[PDB]
Amino acid sequence: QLQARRLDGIDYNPWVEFVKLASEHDVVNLGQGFPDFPPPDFAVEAFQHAVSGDFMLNQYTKTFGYPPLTKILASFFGELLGQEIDPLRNVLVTVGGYGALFTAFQALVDEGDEVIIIEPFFDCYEPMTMMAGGRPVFVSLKPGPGELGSSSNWQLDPMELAGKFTSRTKALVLNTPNNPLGKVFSREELELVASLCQQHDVVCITDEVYQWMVYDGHQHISIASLPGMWERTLTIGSAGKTFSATGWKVGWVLGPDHIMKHLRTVHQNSVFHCPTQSQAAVAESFEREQLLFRQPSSYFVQFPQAMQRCRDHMIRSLQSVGLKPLIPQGSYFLITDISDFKRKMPDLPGAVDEPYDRRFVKWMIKNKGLVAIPVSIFYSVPHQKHFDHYIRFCFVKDEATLQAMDEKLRKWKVE
Amino acid sequence: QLQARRLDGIDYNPWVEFVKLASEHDVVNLGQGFPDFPPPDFAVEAFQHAVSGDFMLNQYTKTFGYPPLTKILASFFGELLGQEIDPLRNVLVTVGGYGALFTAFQALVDEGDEVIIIEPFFDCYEPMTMMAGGRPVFVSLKPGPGELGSSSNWQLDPMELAGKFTSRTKALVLNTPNNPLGKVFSREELELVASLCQQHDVVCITDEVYQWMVYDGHQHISIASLPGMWERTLTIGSAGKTFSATGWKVGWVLGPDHIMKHLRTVHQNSVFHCPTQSQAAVAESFEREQLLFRQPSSYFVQFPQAMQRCRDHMIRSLQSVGLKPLIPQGSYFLITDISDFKRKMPDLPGAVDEPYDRRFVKWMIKNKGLVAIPVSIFYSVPHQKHFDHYIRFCFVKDEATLQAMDEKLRKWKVE
Ligand SMILES: *Cc1c(COP(=O)(O)O)cnc(C)c1O
Numbered sequence: 001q002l003q004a005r006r007l008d009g010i011d012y013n014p015w016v017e018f019v020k021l022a023s024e025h026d027v028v029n030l031g032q033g034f035p036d037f038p039p040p041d042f043a044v045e046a047f048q049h050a051v052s053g054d055f056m057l058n059q060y061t062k063t064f065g066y067p068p069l070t071k072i073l074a075s076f077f078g079e080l081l082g083q084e085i086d087p088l089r090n091v092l093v094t095v096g097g098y099g100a101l102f103t104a105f106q107a108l109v110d111e112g113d114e115v116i117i118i119e120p121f122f123d124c125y126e127p128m129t130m131m132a133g134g135r136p137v138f139v140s141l142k143p144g145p146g147e148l149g150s151s152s153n154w155q156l157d158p159m160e161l162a163g164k165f166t167s168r169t170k171a172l173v174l175n176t177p178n179n180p181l182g183k184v185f186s187r188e189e190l191e192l193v194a195s196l197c198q199q200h201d202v203v204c205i206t207d208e209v210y211q212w213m214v215y216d217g218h219q220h221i222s223i224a225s226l227p228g229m230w231e232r233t234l235t236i237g238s239a240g241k242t243f244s245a246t247g248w249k250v251g252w253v254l255g256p257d258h259i260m261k262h263l264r265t266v267h268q269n270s271v272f273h274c275p276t277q278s279q280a281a282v283a284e285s286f287e288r289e290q291l292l293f294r295q296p297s298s299y300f301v302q303f304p305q306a307m308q309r310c311r312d313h314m315i316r317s318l319q320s321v322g323l324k325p326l327i328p329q330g331s332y333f334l335i336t337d338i339s340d341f342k343r344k345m346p347d348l349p350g351a352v353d354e355p356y357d358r359r360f361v362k363w364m365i366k367n368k369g370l371v372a373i374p375v376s377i378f379y380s381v382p383h384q385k386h387f388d389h390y391i392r393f394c395f396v397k398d399e400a401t402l403q404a405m406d407e408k409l410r411k412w413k414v415e
Numbered sequence: 416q417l418q419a420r421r422l423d424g425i426d427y428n429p430w431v432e433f434v435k436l437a438s439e440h441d442v443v444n445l446g447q448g449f450p451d452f453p454p455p456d457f458a459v460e461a462f463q464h465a466v467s468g469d470f471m472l473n474q475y476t477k478t479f480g481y482p483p484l485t486k487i488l489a490s491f492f493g494e495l496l497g498q499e500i501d502p503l504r505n506v507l508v509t510v511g512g513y514g515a516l517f518t519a520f521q522a523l524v525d526e527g528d529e530v531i532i533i534e535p536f537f538d539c540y541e542p543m544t545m546m547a548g549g550r551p552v553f554v555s556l557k558p559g560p561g562e563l564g565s566s567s568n569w570q571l572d573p574m575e576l577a578g579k580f581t582s583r584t585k586a587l588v589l590n591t592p593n594n595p596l597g598k599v600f601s602r603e604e605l606e607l608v609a610s611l612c613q614q615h616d617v618v619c620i621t622d623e624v625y626q627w628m629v630y631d632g633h634q635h636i637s638i639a640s641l642p643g644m645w646e647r648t649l650t651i652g653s654a655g656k657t658f659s660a661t662g663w664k665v666g667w668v669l670g671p672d673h674i675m676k677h678l679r680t681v682h683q684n685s686v687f688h689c690p691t692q693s694q695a696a697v698a699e700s701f702e703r704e705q706l707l708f709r710q711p712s713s714y715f716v717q718f719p720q721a722m723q724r725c726r727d728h729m730i731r732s733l734q735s736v737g738l739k740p741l742i743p744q745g746s747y748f749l750i751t752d753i754s755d756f757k758r759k760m761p762d763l764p765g766a767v768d769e770p771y772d773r774r775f776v777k778w779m780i781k782n783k784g785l786v787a788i789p790v791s792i793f794y795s796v797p798h799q800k801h802f803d804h805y806i807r808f809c810f811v812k813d814e815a816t817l818q819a820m821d822e823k824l825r826k827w828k829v830e
């Protein structure tokens with residue numbers, strides 16, 4: 001009654017409980033979705049230059065983006081997408097990927113509109129839909145029928161997906177590479193999404209923050225580059241996941257003018273400007289990567305290779321204590337199946353209707369000194385019963401962190 | 416139909432037209448509401464330190480604020496307000512004062528709620544109310560019955576104000592010091608607002624970004640410090656207007672837990688984090704000012720004194736060409752009455768229902784090389800007819816800018 005109705009049912013953050021429990025124990029924290037090592041030297045230096053350069057960078061820049069930033073976005077991403085991008089009509093700088101998602105939902109989603117969300121989903125898609133008055137409609141990726149799983153083998157059933165589309169469908173939210181699963185959507189999968197979006201006249205909100213974090217030769221493909229998709233796609237990126245600097249909180253949306261103008265309305269009536277100097281830092285960092293594009297000294301070549309090693313290390317280490325890793329093709333994350341643990345140890349203490357994975361994670365934090373994230377937080381409440389046996393780890397960590405993880409795991413292995 | 420209905424009627428920005436016209440002429444730009452000189456050395460250095468310190472400052476900080484920042488906010492503003500402020504329950508860091516306003520509206524304003532707005536109003540209060548489904552209700556400050564006006568003499572009629580309150584009133588938006596008028600609300604004025612807010616059970620959203628920019632001995636008083644007001648007030652500040660660094664885009668809201676928790680819900684479902692390093696810079700800048708509080712070497716003492724001189728200079732200069740300055744007691748701004756110009760020059764070219772001041776500003780930009788802002792943009796459409804003879808100047812400018820202004824004015828004076 002004091003508060004607006006749009007806040008109904010979205011006030012709870014399943015995060016807090018675990019972050020609080022982790023802080024009161026000796027732990028290796030693999031639940032945190034950010035690097036615990038520095039960004040690359042060129043990125044840090046770029047920010048250093050922004051706060052010691054033209055003194056006027058301390059003052060407001062342009063509402064829809066620091067023009068050198070929108071310039072390099074339009075040019076670099078224009079090439080990557082095979083699309084002509086105008087900085088002013090087609091690019092909007094936002095407060096991170098979060099802010100870009102929020103701006104898209106607030107622009108397009110209205111009372112009674114349906115939004116298709118693919119499980120497992122980055123958790124904010126559901127409450128952002130709700131706050132905008134929309135109705136979330138869920139479709140599940142399903143693992144196909146060795147011992148190690150693979151994210152590529154989690155399938156989007158064409159018949160199940162087509163059936164979610166109605167006359168009320170406003171948007172489908174596509175996240176690739178996917179958090180938490182680490183799935184990189186194939187060309188054929190995107191074409192399935194694309195053809196339904198075109199058939200039913202639906203906007204595809206595509207969350208591509210992990211674009212550069214792809215492994216084992218897999219290619220990131222943007223759905224907006226597909227025939228006829230540019231006119232119905234919003235593409236989201238994040239400087240923080242791009243340059244390993246999550247605290248910068250700079251993101252962007254790319255899209256056609258007839259859609260983007262509504263995002264600009266939301267922007268101008270919410271934050272109006274993004275900070276100047278961080279934008280300058282991001283622009284300079286992209287100019288560096290555009291200069292060295294495809295070269296062995298580029299961050300976009302070097303970094304994924306280093307993190308693939310971290311991923312492999314973690315897969316072997318966790319595999320070794322009964323956890324069943326699902327090999328991701330992209331992102332910061334892998335999930336492990338804990339089904340074997342649910343069999344041997346079903347009666348873990350917890351609340352009623354509290355999914356096993358949440359109870360397991362609490363158990364692991366207290367007894368084993370390892371933090372992961374229960375995967376059921378990335379599922380609609382109705383589906384959490386069935387998808388209650390996965391936990392998410394982050395492998396984008398310093399060598400010393402993974403060494404500390406190994407120590408915890410060796411101790412665990414002893415009984 | 417593609418876009419959400421909440422966007423109805425809020426897409427137009429009266430700004431663009433003038434910023435575009437100014438850019439295609441030789442001008443002294445006094446329409447810009449930010450300093451064209453550097454922030455103080457300690458502020459710039461604080462940011463420099465943040466991007467060269469602990470490398471982990473490049474990664475996410477806490478959702479509701481960088482803890483050293485919320486700490487100094489709670490402590491310093493706690494003292495200023497005579498209030499005990501808990502960092503976690505009572506402080507929220509936002510993307511500037513803009514973001515803080517937006518967060519407050521989205522948390523509290525719902526379909527059918529009325530919001531009282533005091534004219535002239537910072538222009539975003541109206542569309543933010545509309546986007547949240549609320550109904551703006553307007554009350555006008557009115558100049559009382561020498562040649563130079565005074566912002567202190569613009570009155571809030573107690574009877575007119577009381578009559579705006581209904582059972583649908585959710586919030587009143589109080590901006591002091593006021594942009595564009597430069598009025599600093601007296602204790603008695605705040606008590607009038609306070610007593611009605613308490614009588615009708617209304618939240619006071621108080622925009623106090625210009626808190627430190629007060630002149631001629633006038634005191635900034637926060638309505639939240641008044642008996643019984645803390646429990647129904649949200650107090651907003653902006654690091655950019657505080658430290659002359661508008662591009663930092665760090666702001667905050669202070670308030671009681673039972674209200675703030677709804678703002679936290681909005682925050683967590685919109686941006687989730689604010690950037691880390693700018694927050695660190697702001698924290699260090701406030702620690703500096705708290706250390707030197709009331710001392711002659713403090714920015715909060717030095718800066719207003721310097722800007723008061725700039726204000727006086729501008730008042731004399733503009734007074735000299737027929738413009739009738741209204742002496743502000745606070746803020747970056749003064750307005751001048753252009754009535755004499757409307758008398759001698761009524762038939763200026765423009766669109767139908769285009770207020771005189773908008774036409775005048777266009778004329779002045781093209782012919783006289785000076786930019787100001789038409790004050791009618793800070794009025795509800797119905798009231799723009801009557802309040803069509805004021806323009807807003809910004810005096811927070813480099814000495815050289817004011818010299819250039821004088822040159823333009825001397826040229827003008829010749830016929
Ligand atoms: C981290 C993350 C974001 C948010 O990006 P920021 O730039 O940090 O706001 C958006 N989507 C996914 C899937 C993420 O993992």
Ligand SMILES: *Cc1c(COP(=O)(O)O)cnc(C)c1O
Pocket residue numbers: 448510511512513514537590593594622624652653654655656661664665666
């Ligand atoms: C400039 C201004 C703001 C915005 O503050 P930012 O911190 O720049 O977002 C809010 N209210 C008023 C009255 C202003 O003049």
